[PDB]
Amino acid sequence: AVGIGAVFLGFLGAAGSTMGAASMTLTVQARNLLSGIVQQQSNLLQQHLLKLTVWGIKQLQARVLAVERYLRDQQLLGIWGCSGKLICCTNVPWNSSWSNRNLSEIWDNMTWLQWDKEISNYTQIIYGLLEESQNQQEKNEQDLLALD
Amino acid sequence: AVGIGAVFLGFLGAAGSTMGAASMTLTVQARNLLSGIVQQQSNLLQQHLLKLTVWGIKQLQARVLAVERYLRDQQLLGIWGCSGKLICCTNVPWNSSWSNRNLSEIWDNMTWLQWDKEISNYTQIIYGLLEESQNQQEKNEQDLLALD
Amino acid sequence: AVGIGAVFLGFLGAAGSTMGAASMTLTVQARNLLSGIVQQQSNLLQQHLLKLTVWGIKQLQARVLAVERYLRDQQLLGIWGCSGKLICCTNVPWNSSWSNRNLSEIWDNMTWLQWDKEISNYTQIIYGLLEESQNQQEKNEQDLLALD
Amino acid sequence: ENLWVTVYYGVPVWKDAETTLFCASDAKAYETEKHNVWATHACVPTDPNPQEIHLENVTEEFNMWKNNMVEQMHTDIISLWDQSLKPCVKLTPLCVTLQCTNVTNNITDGELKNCSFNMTTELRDKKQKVYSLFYRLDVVQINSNKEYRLINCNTAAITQACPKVSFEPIPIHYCAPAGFAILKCKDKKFNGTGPCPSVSTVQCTHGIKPVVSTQLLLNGSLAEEEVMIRSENIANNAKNILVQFNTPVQINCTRPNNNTRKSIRIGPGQAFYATGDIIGDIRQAHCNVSKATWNETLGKVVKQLRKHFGNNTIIRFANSAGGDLEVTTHSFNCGGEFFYCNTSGLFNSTWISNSNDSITLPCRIKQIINMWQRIGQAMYAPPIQGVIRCVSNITGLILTRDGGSTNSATETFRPGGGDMRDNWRSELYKYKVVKIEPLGVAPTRCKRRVVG
Amino acid sequence: NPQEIHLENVTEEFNMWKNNMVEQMHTDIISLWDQSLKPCVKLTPLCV
Ligand SMILES: *[C@@H]1O[C@H](CO)[C@@H](O[C@@H]2O[C@H](CO)[C@@H](O[C@@H]3O[C@H](CO[C@H]4O[C@H](CO[C@H]5O[C@H](CO)[C@@H](O)[C@H](O)[C@@H]5O)[C@@H](O)[C@H](O)[C@@H]4O)[C@@H](O)[C@H](O[C@H]4O[C@H](CO)[C@@H](O)[C@H](O)[C@@H]4O[C@H]4O[C@H](CO)[C@@H](O)[C@H](O)[C@@H]4O[C@H]4O[C@H](CO)[C@@H](O)[C@H](O)[C@@H]4O)[C@@H]3O)[C@H](O)[C@H]2NC(C)=O)[C@H](O)[C@H]1NC(C)=O
Ligand SMILES: *[C@@H]1O[C@H](CO)[C@@H](O[C@@H]2O[C@H](CO)[C@@H](O[C@@H]3O[C@H](CO[C@H]4O[C@H](CO)[C@@H](O)[C@H](O)[C@@H]4O)[C@@H](O)[C@H](O[C@H]4O[C@H](CO)[C@@H](O)[C@H](O)[C@@H]4O[C@H]4O[C@H](CO)[C@@H](O)[C@H](O)[C@@H]4O[C@H]4O[C@H](CO)[C@@H](O)[C@H](O)[C@@H]4O)[C@@H]3O)[C@H](O)[C@H]2NC(C)=O)[C@H](O)[C@H]1NC(C)=O
Ligand SMILES: *[C@@H]1O[C@H](CO)[C@@H](O[C@@H]2O[C@H](CO)[C@@H](O[C@@H]3O[C@H](CO[C@H]4O[C@H](CO)[C@@H](O)[C@H](O[C@H]5O[C@H](CO)[C@@H](O)[C@H](O)[C@@H]5O[C@H]5O[C@H](CO)[C@@H](O)[C@H](O)[C@@H]5O)[C@@H]4O)[C@@H](O)[C@H](O[C@H]4O[C@H](CO)[C@@H](O)[C@H](O)[C@@H]4O)[C@@H]3O)[C@H](O)[C@H]2NC(C)=O)[C@H](O)[C@H]1NC(C)=O
Ligand SMILES: *[C@@H]1O[C@H](CO)[C@@H](O[C@@H]2O[C@H](CO)[C@@H](O[C@@H]3O[C@H](CO[C@H]4O[C@H](CO)[C@@H](O)[C@H](O[C@H]5O[C@H](CO)[C@@H](O)[C@H](O)[C@@H]5O)[C@@H]4O)[C@@H](O)[C@H](O[C@H]4O[C@H](CO)[C@@H](O)[C@H](O)[C@@H]4O)[C@@H]3O)[C@H](O)[C@H]2NC(C)=O)[C@H](O)[C@H]1NC(C)=O
Ligand SMILES: *[C@@H]1O[C@H](CO)[C@@H](O[C@@H]2O[C@H](CO)[C@@H](O[C@@H]3O[C@H](CO[C@H]4O[C@H](CO)[C@@H](O)[C@H](O[C@H]5O[C@H](CO)[C@@H](O)[C@H](O)[C@@H]5O[C@H]5O[C@H](CO)[C@@H](O)[C@H](O)[C@@H]5O)[C@@H]4O)[C@@H](O)[C@H](O)[C@@H]3O)[C@H](O)[C@H]2NC(C)=O)[C@H](O)[C@H]1NC(C)=O
Ligand SMILES: *[C@@H]1O[C@H](CO)[C@@H](O[C@@H]2O[C@H](CO)[C@@H](O[C@@H]3O[C@H](CO)[C@@H](O)[C@H](O)[C@@H]3O)[C@H](O)[C@H]2NC(C)=O)[C@H](O)[C@H]1NC(C)=O
Ligand SMILES: *[C@@H]1O[C@H](CO)[C@@H](O[C@@H]2O[C@H](CO)[C@@H](O[C@@H]3O[C@H](CO)[C@@H](O)[C@H](O)[C@@H]3O)[C@H](O)[C@H]2NC(C)=O)[C@H](O)[C@H]1NC(C)=O
Ligand SMILES: *[C@@H]1O[C@H](CO)[C@@H](O[C@@H]2O[C@H](CO)[C@@H](O[C@@H]3O[C@H](CO)[C@@H](O)[C@H](O)[C@@H]3O)[C@H](O)[C@H]2NC(C)=O)[C@H](O)[C@H]1NC(C)=O
Ligand SMILES: *[C@@H]1O[C@H](CO)[C@@H](O[C@@H]2O[C@H](CO)[C@@H](O[C@@H]3O[C@H](CO)[C@@H](O)[C@H](O)[C@@H]3O)[C@H](O)[C@H]2NC(C)=O)[C@H](O)[C@H]1NC(C)=O
Ligand SMILES: *[C@@H]1O[C@H](CO)[C@@H](O[C@@H]2O[C@H](CO)[C@@H](O)[C@H](O)[C@H]2NC(C)=O)[C@H](O)[C@H]1NC(C)=O
Ligand SMILES: *[C@@H]1O[C@H](CO)[C@@H](O[C@@H]2O[C@H](CO)[C@@H](O)[C@H](O)[C@H]2NC(C)=O)[C@H](O)[C@H]1NC(C)=O
Ligand SMILES: *[C@@H]1O[C@H](CO)[C@@H](O)[C@H](O)[C@H]1NC(C)=O
């Protein structure tokens, strides 16, 4: 209806804003990602026998896909050492053949969507060892160094 | 049958005990929360064709609701920085218009159920920024301070 | 077909190798554990009405069991303080009535399968207090000691 | 001057997502009658408030033509019909040969018939003759005094709709799940495809009522604009046109016969709904339009299409000239029996170089329909008793050119309605589902202690 | 073994009249009957 301007800004409300602005609004995304219970109730908000109407089970397929792609996403975080923590710093340098531009030149200049588009091709290969050189051989260390 | 008194005390066995007592028995709850495999087996513990008896799929609806409400609960912990850790300390002060009473006056005096009842109304509003003022702007800090 | 030897080594490719070798290849297992989306697509890679063919829903039963046994496994890690971290050190001593042999005598001598077989009987009892004496009463401490 | 590549959870990001969506509609208790067509009791209730939030300076593509939510939103509608029918009574003991001729009237205007006829009673070897009243289209002849057979008997079976269920359309809000999101476009002059500069975020559709209509749409959404309307590619004739208004004009379809009915028992629990005696006048099904508004809403539909065939060119119109009985004329539902009017008065004008006078449009009523162009078990529509009267709110129409002739001299064209899902493009063109890709790696200077 | 464990000094409401598990526990019993019947023989040639 008529626009009300009381709350700011909202889920993906920073998609049209640069990465620096949205980098601060990471949580108005993280809660809306998984929650398939706030919006769908275990029991409803008598002629029918059982509820295998296809409103029933293809709602049912949706709820798990809601979680599993989250659940495998957050496992990637469990691979890289960031489980309960939304941002994550990183040890292996960036050799910039994936992008030649600066630090200001992205957070102030572009947006998140406008950054994936360009390295969408280099995406899989990086995730190869943001754990291996970062975590696979981060903790044989404190294995071999808490050894004493 | 006749009561046997060998094990102590059990799942929610500290619900009738004060918060301090139950605060130590947080794990006899955390394992019984999700485990829908210990009690339900992937294959059973030949005339039938397939098992779409409604024992089959409304058992099936139950298992995911078992996880997703856990999974969204533990995401709230992932929002507040406590993923693998059951208790969690906290930075933003408590202004006590939500409850005027003391520290001893709850853990020794009341129980957990007997504490939610009174602030059940103030529940949603607090969860607004036990992350924002606690974690949303806890790590732009070490973003801006591991900057060097 | 004919064997190609370009990649090394792979999922469970260290099952025939000693625990020390496989102890370094823990991640070529952790990603293949949950991922039921990489291999199964939310929409397919028109005469039919709806897809309740039993290819549909007993694929559907499989995906959740894929996650829940992971999800309850990784909860055990959330019980022991290791959520995002694959290996985990430990405080309560090992009294060795569960195995009399050495430290070299397992990582260099045996493999992982060849270690569970022998303490498969002592398995449940240990998990009793790799949290209680390790974590249940690890953080009433920093409760009582961050008290100040 | 050293650069690390560090990750972030919850980045506003999205991908063209293909996934199955779900419906949410505010629940009507409605303990009087029961069982809605589609919503039934399974659709989840809409939240007290569905949150709408503006995506600022965002511009994102939209192509409603390879859009999938329509192929879904009819995939459903066909489906659950075939399960709202299956519990209802199966009408195969009726394909019997059941003699009749014309109905009592001074011979004026295949008005209707009245057959008297064999049937099986609740008891097996027991039979009975009783009478009913059919319409021209439901039956076709073969040979005596005289007698015909039911038009579908030729090729398909029939399951009569349970009159307990009703086909009054209600708003349906399709919903994308967590891990995805729909999204709406929000500029009024937006045409069929292109990126939308004004965008705001929804997760569940506004209330779409699934009106079963061929060649026209009505009681639909209405843009605050001057009715600018799109094709898959206007340059070609074969691909349809889909108008929809800016101020709706009223439509009231009528037949003022008070039908009577009579439950009669075919067998164990099966009760066939025979139409009974007519009491009162004989009166044909029709529909009123005041041209005053029609020709002037027409008038604005006139001038805008011009912007694609030159500002100096012919335009044209007359009636549908191709296809079957059901789609050449206005197929739709009103109150329980379906209509089929030649839209003759309407497509009546040429407008070049830029007292009530109400149109009245004769229709014929059907009872047994092979809908959605699907051969197979038919549906017998039970009659409707007493008067009928349905008001209406024209919002749009569907049209198709005829093609080959001299360019720009005088090309002609005509409403087509070759498929229905153009009914779904009517109000599913703001919307587009999209994936959540919420995690992004990006380079900053922070990094925690190198533990060595 | 199903584990039974006493909740000590706990007092909690009970209203068996708007209780739902009954409306379920008959919702079932009606239901699966109508699927233990459907595979069995249909007796309409007998109303003779
Ligand atoms: C464009 O938009 C337009 C604007 O909305 C649309 O116009 C709509 O058109 C539809 C028809 O297609 C209308 O639906 C029908 O309207 C009838 C007229 O409503 C008058 O009465 C209203 C008050 O009474 C209604 O409401 C009360 C609850 O408040 C209810 O108890 C009552 O039964 C009745 O429904 C009044 O407010 C209005 O202003 C009107 O004056 C209405 O009578 C119709 O109800 C029928 O039909 C439907 C369809 O099958 C059934 O689902 C209903 O249950 C009911 O049928 C029952 O009653 C009949 C009465 O004779 C019986 O013959 C039936 O067999 C049946 O009775 C059985 O079942 C009962 C319940 O179990 C038992 O008690 C009986 O004993 C029997 O067993 C229906 O609502 C819309 O109303 C109309 N809109 C508006 C706003 O009026 C237009 O259609 C749109 N265009 C398109 C293309 O869609
Ligand atoms: C398609 O069909 C639709 C539907 O048929 C068409 O749209 C409808 O068109 C109607 C116009 O013909 C319109 O309704 C009418 O409203 C008139 C009032 O308008 C005039 O007066 C007002 C001021 O009062 C002016 O503002 C206005 O400009 C006009 O000058 C009524 O006069 C009409 O008829 C009376 O009878 C009808 C029954 O048909 C009643 O419903 C109506 O109310 C009228 O008066 C009685 O009822 C009222 C209360 O309802 C009483 O106050 C009054 O004294 C009368 O008394 C009776 O009732 C009382 C109880 O209240 C009782 O004590 C007493 O004894 C009497 O029994 C007529 O109603 C519709 O609104 C309109 N519908 C829609 C949806 O737009 C459409 O045009 C058609 N289209 C085409 C293309 O054909
Ligand atoms: C939906 O509703 C609309 C609204 O009407 C319908 O539109 C009608 O559609 C039909 C299609 O079936 C059209 O019929 C076709 O008409 C032509 C013209 O008819 C001529 O041929 C017949 C012989 O077949 C002559 O008898 C006619 O005679 C008229 O003119 C002479 C003088 O010229 C006069 O002596 C006659 O009395 C009659 O005139 C009277 O009426 C006219 C106005 O109509 C008036 O000017 C005059 O003063 C008198 O009042 C006429 O010359 C016809 O040839 C076509 O032939 C087809 O059928 C015949 C058999 O009848 C076959 O021989 C032939 O091979 C074809 O098969 C069509 O019948 C009709 O014109 C049209 N009307 C309008 C107003 O558009 C839609 O059809 C409806 N749709 C559906 C699906 O129901
Ligand atoms: C549905 O489709 C079926 C398919 O055939 C249609 O068939 C009809 O079947 C019936 C029974 O098989 C046919 O009945 C015929 O009746 C005539 C004359 O009957 C009159 O005279 C009889 C004495 O001769 C008398 O018994 C009759 O009824 C009396 O008794 C009843 C009570 O029992 C009472 O209600 C009456 O008032 C009378 O008191 C009636 O008065 C008969 O001549 C026919 O010939 C047969 O039998 C003779 C020997 O008698 C034999 O020589 C013939 O070869 C033939 O075998 C037969 O009995 C009926 O005629 C069929 N229909 C037509 C058009 O002929 C059926 O009608 C369709 N609709 C339905 C069933 O609703
Ligand atoms: C479209 O077409 C339908 C037809 O189906 C019309 O529906 C009819 O509308 C009229 C309104 O004009 C209704 O009449 C009303 O009935 C109610 C209730 O009736 C009670 O009260 C009346 C007196 O007012 C009374 O007549 C009724 O009693 C019946 O039984 C009595 C014996 O106990 C007997 O004395 C009486 O006369 C009547 O039976 C008679 O009829 C039968 C055959 O029909 C005959 O065998 C018998 O011997 C008698 O002669 C009853 O107590 C009243 O309150 C109203 O005042 C008004 O009379 C019709 O009932 C109704 N019919 C149906 C089937 O619905 C639609 O209106 C029409 N609409 C349009 C828009 O055209
Ligand atoms: C993302 O990575 C992919 C893979 O490297 C890049 O795609 C490649 O882009 C080049 C264009 O520079 C394409 O080369 C062209 O090939 C034709 C012959 O087929 C040649 O005539 C042209 O002159 C040109 O060289 C190449 O085909 C294409 N390959 C694939 C697999 O897509 C892409 O450019 C990268 N995108 C960004 C934004 O970095
Ligand atoms: C939890 O928070 C809610 C919301 O503030 C509290 O509910 C409110 O309680 C007051 C009682 O103090 C109710 O006020 C009453 O209103 C009537 C008029 O309607 C007036 O005549 C009475 O004298 C009294 O003032 C108020 O209606 C009620 N509001 C709601 C929405 O429930 C509740 O008390 C809080 N509970 C605890 C334990 O703190
Ligand atoms: C894992 O733990 C189980 C439980 O302690 C061990 O199983 C036990 O093994 C002994 C063999 O040393 C079995 O004892 C035998 O009993 C018969 C009489 O029934 C006796 O005649 C034999 O001389 C022998 O003493 C015992 O039955 C068996 N119990 C169970 C429950 O399996 C098992 O050996 C352990 N495995 C390893 C690898 O440590
Ligand atoms: C009352 O019922 C009779 C049927 O028993 C209707 O008579 C029918 O009249 C039409 C013409 O009005 C005849 O149609 C003819 O069709 C042939 C092609 O099949 C065509 O070449 C002729 O020029 C004519 O159009 C039809 O054969 C005839 N039915 C018969 C003889 O069985 C009569 O029209 C009905 N009453 C009303 C008012 O319609
Ligand atoms: C028919 O169209 C009107 C708008 O032309 C829709 O809204 C009605 O608008 C009139 C004034 O323009 C108001 O007096 C009515 O109260 C409005 N009705 C409603 C229900 O909002 C109307 O909704 C349309 N009818 C439908 C959709 O059935
Ligand atoms: C426009 O269409 C109408 C029919 O909707 C035509 O109206 C006919 O006009 C004559 C008067 O010459 C009337 O006697 C007829 O009764 C009308 N027919 C009908 C079916 O109502 C009208 O001729 C058309 N005009 C043009 C130029 O196409
Ligand atoms: C003007 O009309 C002619 C034919 O009358 C047509 O060929 C030409 O395209 C038109 N020009 C414009 C600009 O519409």
Side-chain angles (χ1 to χ4, degrees), chain D residues 37-38 77-78 80-86 88-91 94 138 150-152 156-163 165-168 212 272 326 332-338 340 366-372 374-384:
Chain D
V37 49
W38 299 297
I77 294 206
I78 309 171
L80 60 152
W81 202 276
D82 308 6
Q83 297 164 46
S84 57
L85 60 67
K86 277 253 168 180
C88 300
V89 300
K90 184 60 189 95
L91 299 214
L94 192 93
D138 308 14
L150 296 104
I151 183 176
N152 79 69
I158 299 86
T159 77
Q160 161 177 12
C162 282
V165 316
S166 44
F167 302 156
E168 74 287 62
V212 278
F272 165 77
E326 272 176 295
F332 68 94
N333 172 299
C334 216
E337 234 157 59
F338 312 148
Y340 295 88
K366 264 306 302 294
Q367 307 214 322
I368 303 98
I369 49 141
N370 303 331
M371 216 193 321
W372 30 66
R374 291 302 139 212
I375 313 305
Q377 57 180 341
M379 143 172 167
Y380 163 59
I384 59 199

Side-chain angles (χ1 to χ4, degrees), chain A residues 7 9-12 14-16 19 22 25-26 29-30 32-35 39-41 44-45 47-48 53 55 58-59 61-62 65-66 69-70 73-74 77 80 82 86-94 103 106-107 112-113 115-116 126-127 130 138 142, chain D residues 3-14 19-23 34-35 38-47 52-58 76 80 174 177-181 201 203 435-444 446-448 451-452:
Chain A
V7 309
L9 215 174
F11 178 80
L12 264 54
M19 328 171 62
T25 62
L26 300 174
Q29 265 79 333
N32 279 343
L33 188 288
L34 201 296
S35 71
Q39 60 191 8
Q40 305 129 303
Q41 306 70 243
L44 280 79
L45 195 155
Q47 36 73 22
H48 273 132
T53 313
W55 291 137
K58 283 313 194 228
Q59 171 194 233
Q61 161 161 66
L65 175 80
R69 72 169 22 246
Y70 159 99
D73 250 10
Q74 278 221 16
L77 298 201
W80 311 331
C82 298
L86 299 324
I87 39 78
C88 300
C89 293
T90 284
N91 82 65
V92 189
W94 182 26
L103 177 279
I106 62 181
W107 319 94
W112 294 95
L113 308 82
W115 160 259
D116 190 0
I126 197 192
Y127 308 82
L130 304 88
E138 168 167 308
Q142 322 111 30
Chain D
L3 274 197
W4 317 143
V5 278
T6 52
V7 316
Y8 323 81
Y9 193 143
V11 298
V13 83
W14 63 69
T19 204
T20 74
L21 298 69
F22 78 100
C23 155
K34 257 86 203 295
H35 297 256
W38 299 297
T40 173
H41 307 62
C43 275
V44 200
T46 76
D47 311 85
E52 161 141 308
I53 295 304
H54 190 352
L55 273 276
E56 260 280 18
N57 304 281
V58 178
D76 325 309
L80 60 152
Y174 269 70
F180 306 88
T201 185
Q203 190 201 337
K435 202 152 97 161
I436 289 154
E437 314 268 63
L439 312 197
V441 292
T444 189
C446 155
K447 180 200 155 332
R448 253 303 167 270
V451 307

Side-chain angles (χ1 to χ4, degrees), chain C residues 35-50:
Chain C
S35 71
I37 312 122
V38 50
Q39 60 191 8
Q40 305 129 303
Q41 306 70 243
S42 54
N43 181 298
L44 280 79
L45 195 155
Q46 200 195 353
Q47 36 73 22
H48 273 132
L49 283 314
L50 298 319

Side-chain angles (χ1 to χ4, degrees), chain C residues 55-68:
Chain C
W55 291 137
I57 172 168
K58 283 313 194 228
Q59 171 194 233
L60 173 131
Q61 161 161 66
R63 272 107 30 81
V64 303
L65 175 80
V67 312
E68 307 176 307

Side-chain angles (χ1 to χ4, degrees), chain B residues 44-112:
Chain B
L44 280 79
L45 195 155
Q46 200 195 353
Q47 36 73 22
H48 273 132
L49 283 314
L50 298 319
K51 324 292 166 291
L52 285 82
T53 313
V54 293
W55 291 137
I57 172 168
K58 283 313 194 228
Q59 171 194 233
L60 173 131
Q61 161 161 66
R63 272 107 30 81
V64 303
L65 175 80
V67 312
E68 307 176 307
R69 72 169 22 246
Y70 159 99
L71 288 206
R72 80 97 166 71
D73 250 10
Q74 278 221 16
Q75 173 84 343
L76 292 201
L77 298 201
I79 308 267
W80 311 331
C82 298
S83 51
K85 153 219 312 182
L86 299 324
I87 39 78
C88 300
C89 293
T90 284
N91 82 65
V92 189
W94 182 26
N95 76 85
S96 100
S97 268
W98 316 336
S99 126
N100 193 279
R101 314 195 62 265
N102 261 269
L103 177 279
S104 193
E105 284 74 337
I106 62 181
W107 319 94
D108 274 47
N109 174 29
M110 305 212 284
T111 186
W112 294 95

